[PDB]
């Protein structure tokens, strides 16, 4: 993993772009790894890192979500791509177009032989001005749901400690959609959208923390 934790290679922190679509039997996390994108947190981080690690692959499949009346590909100064602003490669920062952020209501059927892992997020602004500047509505909400599960997250506004310049945060969540099942995403603000899904696999794959060098 060199400079990258598994979760950072998952989200697509720019310095981790080399790990796109990689497979592993054992993923080695080094103590010198560092994050260098939007400051984020993962509720049950341990569980997300576990299930990805156990899956053994970062194989990603793009999908087109029917986003309507919002702008895509928002970037941040905390996550540069060279000299200009950037963002996590596998996530899609959505914001207002013109002066409205209409409600989003999209679907994605799993019609495939295998399970899909969707990674998505929710944006926590530092101020109400920031909240309304980006999403027009004063109070966002994100709802991601299958037929047998739902997660609705309310974004929380307020200051956190400066990290790479920002008081704001993104919270990462996940959703597994089984074959025959159907993903629906509902939001009127603060949605950090998935650009597709990760393949899920089962087998002997894991992850380990070590600074031992690798040998032939």
């Amino acid at each position, epitope marked *: 993993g060199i400079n990258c934790t598994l979760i950072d290679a998952l989200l697509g922190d720019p310095h981790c772009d080399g790990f796109q679509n990689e497979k592993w039997d054992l993923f080695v996390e080094r103590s010198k790894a560092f994050s260098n994108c939007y400051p984020y947190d993962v509720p049950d981080y341990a569980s997300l890192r576990s299930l990805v690690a156990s899956s053994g692959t970062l194989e990603f499949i793009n999908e087109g979500f029917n986003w309507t009346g919002v702008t895509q590909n928002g*970037g941040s*100064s905390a996550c540069k791509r060279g000299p*200009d*602003s950037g*963002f996590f490669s596998r996530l899609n920062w959505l914001y207002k177009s013109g*002066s409205t952020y209409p409600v989003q209501n999209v679907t994605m059927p799993n019609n495939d032989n295998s399970d899909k892992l969707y990674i998505w997020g929710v944006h926590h602004p530092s101020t109400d*001005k920031e909240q309304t500047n980006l999403y027009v509505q004063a109070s966002g909400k994100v709802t991601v749901s299958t037929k047998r599960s739902q997660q609705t997250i309310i974004p929380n506004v307020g200051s956190r400690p400066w990290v790479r310049g920002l008081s*704001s945060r993104i919270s990462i969540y996940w959703t597994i959609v089984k074959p025959g099942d159907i993903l629906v995403i509902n939001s009127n603000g603060n949605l950090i959208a998935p650009r597709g899904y990760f393949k899920m696999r089962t087998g002997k794959s894991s992850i380990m923390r070590s600074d031992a060098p690798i040998g032939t």
Partner: antibody
Amino acid sequence: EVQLVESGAEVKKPGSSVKVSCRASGTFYKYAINWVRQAPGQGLEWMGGIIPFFGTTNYAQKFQGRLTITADGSTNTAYMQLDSLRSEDTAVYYCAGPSITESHYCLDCAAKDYYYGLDVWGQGTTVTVSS
Amino acid sequence: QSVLTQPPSASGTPGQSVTISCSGSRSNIGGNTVNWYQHLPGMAPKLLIYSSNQRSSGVPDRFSGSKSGTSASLAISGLQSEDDADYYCASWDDSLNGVVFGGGTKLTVLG
């Protein structure tokens, strides 16, 4: 693509206040809209700018307190208000902005990152300050 | 007394080249890109150069800008009669926290 049209020429008594409008012919909100004047016999003087998306203003310190730059997103219009008019404020007032587009926009950079070379100008509004 | 300093005039006959200089400081030019404008008064200014050295669209290649340290130059080679106008440099100034313009240079095409 976009064209800016400013409001009509005015005349004001000293002490009074003036508000000039700038109407874009298309969405023109993501980057810094600038106000720049020219008094008779002087070079161009930068008044200030707004970035409609965030509502963010930057003013030349010389005008702090009497200059207010404002924007309305639905009608694609920027406004410039100048109070306590002296005769030195007699000038042609231009509004101007850049034509850049970006597939990946930055939602949190510094104001200055949104200011670019001004290649779309309004025609200018003559404000004359007299009794 | 503009923050950026241009000479007030420049001249030449058709075909010559002229160099219009802009003298600033750390807080503006030495740390920011410079733009150049052209102005034939009563009618609105026009952008010629952005990013210190890029011709804006439709601007003839005889116009060129450059920057080094805390100054900037606009070079017009192969001068033409249409070029008789006012020229201004501008840039962001990090201490003023706004844009500053040069005092302008009046270019007169003679002959």
